[PDB]
Amino acid sequence: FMATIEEIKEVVLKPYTNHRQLTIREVETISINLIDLLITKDVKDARTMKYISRFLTKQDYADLVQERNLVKRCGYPLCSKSQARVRDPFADYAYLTEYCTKAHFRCSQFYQFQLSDEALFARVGVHLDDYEPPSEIQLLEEVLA
Ligand SMILES: [Zn+2]
């Protein structure tokens, strides 16, 4: 139904649990499999959303949002609605084309602003169960957005 930390470890990271170093191709394979998972499914909860951030640059997140919109999902990964204005190809304010609401626009920006532009490949040991992020990512409550 919805994606969790446990699932990501199993369907994305499982091959790499015993690697002490990753190649550039293996890092790319992780991002692709993670993005793929997050367009087929929505993120179940806050804890998973905070876990994700270690695998996303600000640009990978923007691309996540785009790919989610192409399958008619609200850009904000915790959401299971569509963007409010799904782009019709037979033709021919702006945030409503990417999000269900202004609130999800803001939650999405709030999350993105905190993501790092450090390349995934430069994030030493991010694939490991013992990795420690350089700060805890904050999620904006919808009511405050
Ligand atoms: Zn939404």
Contact 79, 108 (CB under 8 A): no
Ligand 1 centroid to Cα of residue 32, in Å, is 23
Instruction: State the binding site for Zn(2+).
Output: 74, 79, 100, 104
Residue 94 is given by DSSP the state G
All domains of the chain in start order, with CATH: 1-145 (1.25.40.820)
Ligand 1 centroid to Cα of residue 87, in Å, is 15
Residue 101 is given by DSSP the state S
Listed residue (139, 128, 140, 142) closest to 54, CA to CA: 128
Listed residue (61, 136, 139) closest to 103, CA to CA: 139
**Cα 75 off chain centre by:** 9
Ligand 1 centroid to Cα of residue 98, in Å, is 9
Ligand 1 centroid to Cα of residue 102, in Å, is 9
Write out the two tokens for 1. Answer: 């139904």
Cα 113 from Cα 95, distance rounded (Å): 16
Deposited resolution, Å: 2.1
Distant-in-sequence contacts of 112-117, Cβ < 8 A, 24+ apart: 112/58, 112/61, 112/62, 114/53, 114/138, 115/53, 115/56, 115/57, 115/58, 115/61, 116/57, 116/58, 117/57, 117/58, 117/59
Ligand 1 centroid to Cα of residue 18, in Å, is 37
Collapse the DSSP code of 131 into the 3-class scheme (helix H, G, I; strand E, B; otherwise coil) and give the result: coil
Method by which this entry was solved: X-ray
Contact 42, 77 (CB under 8 A): yes
Ligand 1 centroid to Cα of residue 96, in Å, is 10
